[PDB]
Amino acid sequence: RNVALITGITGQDGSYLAEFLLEKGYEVHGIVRRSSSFNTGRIEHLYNMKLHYGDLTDSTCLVKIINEVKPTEIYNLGAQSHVKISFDLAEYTADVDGVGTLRLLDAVKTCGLINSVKFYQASTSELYGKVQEIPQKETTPFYPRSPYGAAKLYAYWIVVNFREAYNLFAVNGILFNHESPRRGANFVTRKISRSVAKIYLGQLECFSLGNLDAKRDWGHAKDYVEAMWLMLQNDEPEDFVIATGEVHSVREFVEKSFLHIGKTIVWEGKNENEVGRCKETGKVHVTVDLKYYRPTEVDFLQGDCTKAKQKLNWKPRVAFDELVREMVHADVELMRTN
Amino acid sequence: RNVALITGITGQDGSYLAEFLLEKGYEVHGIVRRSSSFNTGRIEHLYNMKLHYGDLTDSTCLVKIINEVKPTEIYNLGAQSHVKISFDLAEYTADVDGVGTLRLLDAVKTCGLINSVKFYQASTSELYGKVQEIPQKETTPFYPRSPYGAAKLYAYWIVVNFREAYNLFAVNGILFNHESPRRGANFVTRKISRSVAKIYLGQLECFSLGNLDAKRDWGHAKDYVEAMWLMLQNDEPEDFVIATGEVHSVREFVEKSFLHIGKTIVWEGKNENEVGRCKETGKVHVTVDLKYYRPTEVDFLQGDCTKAKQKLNWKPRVAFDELVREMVHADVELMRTN
Amino acid sequence: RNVALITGITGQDGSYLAEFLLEKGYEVHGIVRRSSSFNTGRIEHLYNMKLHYGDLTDSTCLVKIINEVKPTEIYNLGAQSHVKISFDLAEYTADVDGVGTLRLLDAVKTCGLINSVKFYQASTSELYGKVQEIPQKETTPFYPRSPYGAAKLYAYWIVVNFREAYNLFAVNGILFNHESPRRGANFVTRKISRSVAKIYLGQLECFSLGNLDAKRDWGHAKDYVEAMWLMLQNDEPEDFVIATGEVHSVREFVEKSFLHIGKTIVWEGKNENEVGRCKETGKVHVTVDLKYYRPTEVDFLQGDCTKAKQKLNWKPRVAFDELVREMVHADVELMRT
Amino acid sequence: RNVALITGITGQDGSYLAEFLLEKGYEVHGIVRRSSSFNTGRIEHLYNMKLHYGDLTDSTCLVKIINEVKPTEIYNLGAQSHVKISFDLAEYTADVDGVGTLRLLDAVKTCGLINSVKFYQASTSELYGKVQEIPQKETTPFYPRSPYGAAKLYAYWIVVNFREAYNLFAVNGILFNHESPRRGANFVTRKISRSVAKIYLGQLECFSLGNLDAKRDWGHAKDYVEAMWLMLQNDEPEDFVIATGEVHSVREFVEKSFLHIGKTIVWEGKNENEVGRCKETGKVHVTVDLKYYRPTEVDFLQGDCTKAKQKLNWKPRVAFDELVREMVHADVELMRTN
Numbered sequence A, B, D: 001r002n003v004a005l006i007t008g009i010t011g012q013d014g015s016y017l018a019e020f021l022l023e024k025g026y027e028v029h030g031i032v033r034r035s036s037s038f039n040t041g042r043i044e045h046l047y048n049m050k051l052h053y054g055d056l057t058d059s060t061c062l063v064k065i066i067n068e069v070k071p072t073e074i075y076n077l078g079a080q081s082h083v084k085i086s087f088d089l090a091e092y093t094a095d096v097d098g099v100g101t102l103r104l105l106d107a108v109k110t111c112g113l114i115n116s117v118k119f120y121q122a123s124t125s126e127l128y129g130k131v132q133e134i135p136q137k138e139t140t141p142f143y144p145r146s147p148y149g150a151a152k153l154y155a156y157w158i159v160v161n162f163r164e165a166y167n168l169f170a171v172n173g174i175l176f177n178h179e180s181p182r183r184g185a186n187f188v189t190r191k192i193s194r195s196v197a198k199i200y201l202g203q204l205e206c207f208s209l210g211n212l213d214a215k216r217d218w219g220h221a222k223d224y225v226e227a228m229w230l231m232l233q234n235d236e237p238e239d240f241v242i243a244t245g246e247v248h249s250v251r252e253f254v255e256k257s258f259l260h261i262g263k264t265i266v267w268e269g270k271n272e273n274e275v276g277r278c279k280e281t282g283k284v285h286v287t288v289d290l291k292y293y294r295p296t297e298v299d300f301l302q303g304d305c306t307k308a309k310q311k312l313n314w315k316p317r318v319a320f321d322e323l324v325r326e327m328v329h330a331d332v333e334l335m336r337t338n
Numbered sequence C: 001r002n003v004a005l006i007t008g009i010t011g012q013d014g015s016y017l018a019e020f021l022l023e024k025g026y027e028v029h030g031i032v033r034r035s036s037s038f039n040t041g042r043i044e045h046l047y048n049m050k051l052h053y054g055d056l057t058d059s060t061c062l063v064k065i066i067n068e069v070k071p072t073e074i075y076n077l078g079a080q081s082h083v084k085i086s087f088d089l090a091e092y093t094a095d096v097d098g099v100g101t102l103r104l105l106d107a108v109k110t111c112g113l114i115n116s117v118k119f120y121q122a123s124t125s126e127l128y129g130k131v132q133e134i135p136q137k138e139t140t141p142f143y144p145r146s147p148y149g150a151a152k153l154y155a156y157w158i159v160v161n162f163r164e165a166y167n168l169f170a171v172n173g174i175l176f177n178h179e180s181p182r183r184g185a186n187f188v189t190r191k192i193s194r195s196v197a198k199i200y201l202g203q204l205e206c207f208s209l210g211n212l213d214a215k216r217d218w219g220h221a222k223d224y225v226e227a228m229w230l231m232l233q234n235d236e237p238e239d240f241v242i243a244t245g246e247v248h249s250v251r252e253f254v255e256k257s258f259l260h261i262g263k264t265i266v267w268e269g270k271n272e273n274e275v276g277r278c279k280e281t282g283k284v285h286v287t288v289d290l291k292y293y294r295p296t297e298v299d300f301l302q303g304d305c306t307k308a309k310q311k312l313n314w315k316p317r318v319a320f321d322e323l324v325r326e327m328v329h330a331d332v333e334l335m336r337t
């Protein structure tokens, strides 16, 4: 008996995880938000999958779904997951990402499955914020830098408390940034690949970004959902960092993406006046707008996943250069039909 | 200076109202929910229009948006608007549709606009529920029949209270059911037009409905948004019913719809056993499934818009027959493209 | 098996209801809010009674409590119950009085007791607000006049909806104003009795009120909680107005309270400048301050409780004059200490 | 000139802090919760103090109060502060202690006072939970052990975020346990001093406790509120541990309290069967009940306040022995009356 309940199923990770579990024969249930428009685009092709309307801010609907499903595994991937947006939607972010994790854990307990279900919490490298060690590992002290990070830090600890207080098998996946052709358009990587594709297809000339110098450890979401499953197959509930260990800047993501389009970006200027120009035509394709900057930036992330490699036999499979090429090519094809 | 702020701008009505106001030279602002997927499909062609991330359950976010926008007219169309879904998402529905209306009124008062802004609240014929008079007018006593109805009733009265307590120009548009080619696919009219369109195209053979006997007063959303604006142009803030005054059953909507694709439906059986088959080929095209029924149904609605005619000089332009035709043709063209 | 769960057990009504049910041999459980200070003053003498920490804004705590208690009767009396206060705490009032009622109903359902518990909702005459008929009865249309009234109106209908959708035995008691020596200090009657008692004791010289001309139908809370239990004893779940049918103004409550400490108030002036002065001593003891007015007043309330008299055989025992005397005498004794 | 706004003014710390600030000539404002009973007992003798009704879960009321008061200093002491209660009131504790801190910070920002107010957050040694270093200091990593600790940890970091993101002068006082004759009756120290006083007076014979072996750093609340004010007088906003650095067990607090009433307690038995019996009379005066234990105990706390001592010139004045004597003596006088 393998029955998974995935909150956040319509999102990037939930769509890949649903495919991964379905491939292993699981009965997969997802919680979907009511929307005035179609919002199951990433999982429509899958429709052993059953969807249920619900919301992490509504405790009763969570108890009803859990009681009906009686899941053996629960992956809480549901979240307002964008950092910039969390600065103006701070309360909504706390209620969903923080208190919502509590509501889900308490629904499991109310449903009497405290000793039967395994629970995965979608923790994040954003918890390290202004990093206290480089690279960051499980024992590196957290230092959140946004309402999103603080809300996720509450969720990380309430999951630890349910594990310690009630013996729930619950684990925190401390995942560093992971992208894919399904990444939300609002994250920097997908914003770049979509924009570069458009410029290639002549649908766009230039686009603006915020902080070009931010440095990230970027992996492919498909590889990372496999780590979530591996953490719930472990004999004991443990928390793990999952990451690539390699760092690149936003500037580098931009340069490599344009290379796939046949253009070489040359940078000129500083700060909000810096621009990215085609080395040949001299045409400006990238500009900077402070409106995209964060009040308290997270300047650098680099994860050390030695524990996961040794205990779960997990490892990144897709590297940075291949990730970038895949996203640009996927968006060129997508935009082609536009 | 005409600056409108529309909550629920990505929904059916918000998309038509944005068009209507843009056409009048308004500066239009909309509050959009953060989503992991693209969710501005109904208004993307409008890109005079400014969108702001927000949520009716986050008070500060509404204050920030209203201070930045400084609107002269606010239309609160945002809501979890589906009745059936409200039974399992009762709390979220009360928080968004009921308390959210107060959050928006309180943001207005906090932003110092109580004496300058005009506020439109999206009330609804669902307030009459188990109807206390036929037809229903502004003075017919309410009798909600779902968590949605109850939440909208709290919103109706908190709006009346800000009007009476603080002289805010605030009104309740008590609109009866209105549809269009942009209607959510989950509502009965669009579920029928889309399903009939697929059958015609050979992309579907049969679909199931819930209660065939329910009767509704159905108008076209494009006509009704005009009445919203007119209420905000009236000299005094008053509440108004907006409706066609004509009633049809779900069964008749089904019949007229198949008629537009050259099929005549004949019914057999009763209750959940009843079926709809092509009178010419005898093929079953419509079945019933209890899962679509509601615990406490709203059997009948017929609205009386005499007051709106007298003070607004308003009257519906599209009638029932034209509405069904338009939706079925629209969906045949949409399904044909994919 | 008689097990009652009372939300709002520390408040006026909850305290009288808990006593009434304990006298009938019920096992009584109440939900109490965590407080930094002692807050069980009204029910300490009762401590058959068990208390549980909880809050109507925390869903899980309500499920936990109900699951443990398995009550046969639930009385939802918990609420931010003050009208003036609701204008400045309109959202908290909505969340506790409106959504909190839904939270308790869903907890019942979640716990599998939808068919085994009888539920009483503390509805109110404030629902009639700007009254649409006089007197007001079960069928008089509602017209709320404050964030409190709107929130209680939502509660009223969500209770009807659980009754209609799921066959829960749930009832709305539409109670008109009821007071007692246990009434909160900031309601008008207790404000007047405590202030009049302090004046008699030489602890105060004068106090200010708001709208002296408001009219109310005032009963005694001890009489009204009996009606709540009667509603749950009824064969079918029905809604009932509970009231005295007699009206008095705030001004009359003031006059009668002063007569009980040996003073005759004589009014002079108008509106915010009106004052009540002692006939014998010539001292001003009552003034008016607009800060006590409500933006949208409820001018008049008079309940018709024919239905309850007929079906429940309920009748109020304490009349207005006796309520005033009891409140003033009790506060004179209370303030002496 | 000097205007303080204190949330949690009716509690133990708020009552002492109000007195400390009134002595310095401050105009002191407090936020008090609406209650069906008198709830201002600790501050009624103060009657330059003004009270405002409000709740940390209602943002509109906080904006209204901060606008009216325009404080130069805000002390956020308001909280559901009991650890045991937080296990069954986890969501309410999160909404008040965690999110409520965000609401108060956002209200300061909405009110335009981000650059003029100084903000003190009531952080706590419970943040160290399962302690990662002994003694604990500012740089010791947090490890919360209850819904109260997780909620306070969200609050600690959202305060840090407003300081860094918006230059708010905001500080976290990481205070270790502090008690007084005004401590809440449900906390262990006051439970013991009240019970022992009743025993001395003949009003009680025995009482039950939970975990006798817990160890704590106990100081006197009057000394500690002085530190809160000192942190807001510092030139730069910094976080500080405030504590005595001396540690005792619950068992020693029981033993010393009984000594003040002329009794020597002798322990017998183990775990939930352990009892404390009078050496002279052999009467049992203390028993153990597992219902007072916590699922995840905080076994030991010892604070290192070296930073505060050096930068603020603060030092604890009341030592443990005197704290116990004062509390038992005050409770004997209190109970003598009734």
Ligand SMILES: NC(=O)C1=CN([C@@H]2O[C@H](COP(=O)(O)OP(=O)(O)OC[C@H]3O[C@@H](n4cnc5c(N)ncnc54)[C@H](OP(=O)(O)O)[C@@H]3O)[C@@H](O)[C@H]2O)C=CC1
Binding pocket: A007, A008, A009, A010, A011, A012, A013, A014, A031, A032, A033, A039, A054, A055, A056, A057, A076, A077, A078, A079, A080, A081, A082, A096, A100, A122, A123, A124, A125, A174, A175, A176, A177, A178, A179, A184, B034, B035, B036, B037
């Ligand atoms: N991707 C990354 O690089 C990293 C992500 N994370 C975290 O991992 C998880 C997965 O991330 P990812 O797939 O990219 O995120 P997405 O933003 O793509 O997806 C978020 C999901 O959560 C749902 N959701 C949001 N709010 C609610 C709510 N109130 N109730 C129920 N569901 C809700 C969304 O639904 P809807 O479609 O309706 O919006 C969507 O299904 C998230 O928790 C994210 O914070 C952790 C480390 C790094």
Ligand SMILES: NC(=O)C1=CN([C@@H]2O[C@H](COP(=O)(O)OP(=O)(O)OC[C@H]3O[C@@H](n4cnc5c(N)ncnc54)[C@H](OP(=O)(O)O)[C@@H]3O)[C@@H](O)[C@H]2O)C=CC1
Binding pocket: A034, A035, A036, A037, B007, B008, B009, B010, B011, B012, B013, B014, B031, B032, B033, B035, B039, B054, B055, B056, B057, B076, B077, B078, B079, B080, B081, B082, B096, B122, B123, B124, B125, B174, B175, B176, B177, B178, B179, B184
């Ligand atoms: N249409 C009808 O027949 C009738 C409708 N009404 C009411 O009129 C209004 C418009 O109806 P209609 O356009 O059909 O409804 P839709 O369901 O099409 O649109 C609802 C809108 O509200 C938004 N919304 C939902 N929840 C929130 C939230 N928490 N915060 C912010 N925005 C939110 C939706 O966003 P998203 O796209 O992200 O879901 C969408 O923009 C609604 O209030 C509805 O209840 C009244 C009478 C009859």
Ligand SMILES: NC(=O)C1=CN([C@@H]2O[C@H](COP(=O)(O)OP(=O)(O)OC[C@H]3O[C@@H](n4cnc5c(N)ncnc54)[C@H](OP(=O)(O)O)[C@@H]3O)[C@@H](O)[C@H]2O)C=CC1
Binding pocket: C007, C008, C009, C010, C011, C012, C013, C014, C031, C032, C033, C039, C054, C055, C056, C057, C076, C077, C078, C079, C080, C081, C082, C096, C100, C122, C123, C124, C125, C174, C175, C176, C177, C178, C179, C184, D034, D035, D036, D037
């Ligand atoms: N009395 C009247 O004249 C009328 C009253 N009513 C209603 O009847 C009920 C009883 O009234 P009455 O006793 O005078 O009211 P009180 O104000 O004296 O008592 C209210 C009770 O509700 C509790 N409460 C408030 N908020 C919450 C919350 N969030 N969670 C849990 N409990 C909460 C209070 O606790 P705490 O002590 O912690 O504040 C108290 O126990 C109320 O619902 C009131 O609205 C109806 C008709 C008329």
Ligand SMILES: NC(=O)C1=CN([C@@H]2O[C@H](COP(=O)(O)OP(=O)(O)OC[C@H]3O[C@@H](n4cnc5c(N)ncnc54)[C@H](OP(=O)(O)O)[C@@H]3O)[C@@H](O)[C@H]2O)C=CC1
Binding pocket: C034, C035, C036, C037, D007, D008, D009, D010, D011, D012, D013, D014, D031, D032, D033, D035, D039, D054, D055, D056, D057, D076, D077, D078, D079, D080, D081, D082, D096, D122, D123, D124, D125, D174, D175, D176, D177, D178, D179, D184
């Ligand atoms: N004392 C200690 O040993 C330690 C305490 N702390 C923290 O320091 C602060 C002061 O502690 P202490 O005085 O002992 O605590 P108390 O429990 O004595 O006081 C708590 C205060 O918060 C108020 N409050 C609770 N909930 C709300 C709400 N929703 N809205 C508004 N006000 C509310 C209480 O009001 P009401 O009277 O109505 O309940 C009371 O005024 C708290 O934040 C506590 O968590 C930090 C370190 C150690």
Ligand SMILES: Nc1nc2c(ncn2[C@@H]2O[C@H](COP(=O)(O)OP(=O)(O)O)[C@@H](O)[C@H]2O)c(=O)[nH]1
Binding pocket: A083, A084, A126, A177, A186, A187, A188, A189, A191, A208, A209, A210, A211, A212, A214, A215, A216, A250, A292, A293, A294, A297, A298, A299
């Ligand atoms: N989303 C986003 N990030 C940007 C942009 N320009 C630069 N960045 C930076 O890119 C980094 C990664 O951002 P994002 O993809 O949102 O993921 P995060 O690591 O979860 O914040 C951060 O340092 C952002 O500030 C932009 O336009 N959008």
Ligand SMILES: Nc1nc2c(ncn2[C@@H]2O[C@H](COP(=O)(O)OP(=O)(O)O)[C@@H](O)[C@H]2O)c(=O)[nH]1
Binding pocket: B083, B084, B126, B177, B186, B187, B188, B189, B191, B208, B209, B210, B211, B212, B214, B215, B216, B250, B292, B293, B294, B297, B298, B299
């Ligand atoms: N949404 C929906 N309604 C259905 C269906 N079958 C019958 N109905 C009924 O059609 C009526 C209109 O439903 P809907 O379009 O959702 O709008 P409402 O009037 O706001 O409930 C109600 O009485 C429904 O019970 C169905 O499959 N879906």
Ligand SMILES: Nc1nc2c(ncn2[C@@H]2O[C@H](COP(=O)(O)OP(=O)(O)O)[C@@H](O)[C@H]2O)c(=O)[nH]1
Binding pocket: C082, C083, C084, C126, C177, C186, C187, C188, C189, C191, C208, C209, C210, C211, C212, C214, C215, C216, C250, C292, C293, C294, C297, C298, C299
């Ligand atoms: N609470 C209160 N009510 C007052 C005061 N002065 C006049 N009233 C009026 O007395 C009536 C009853 O108020 P209250 O006892 O609060 O009960 P309500 O009927 O629940 O509002 C209302 O019309 C109030 O406006 C005053 O100082 N306090």
Ligand SMILES: Nc1nc2c(ncn2[C@@H]2O[C@H](COP(=O)(O)OP(=O)(O)O)[C@@H](O)[C@H]2O)c(=O)[nH]1
Binding pocket: D082, D083, D084, D126, D177, D186, D187, D188, D189, D191, D208, D209, D210, D211, D212, D214, D215, D216, D250, D292, D293, D294, D297, D298
């Ligand atoms: N409140 C309380 N704590 C107890 C009791 N018996 C032992 N303790 C322990 O004493 C310690 C202090 O508890 P408390 O005074 O509530 O403060 P905390 O340090 O904020 O939990 C904790 O380890 C409790 O488990 C008891 O009966 N009540």
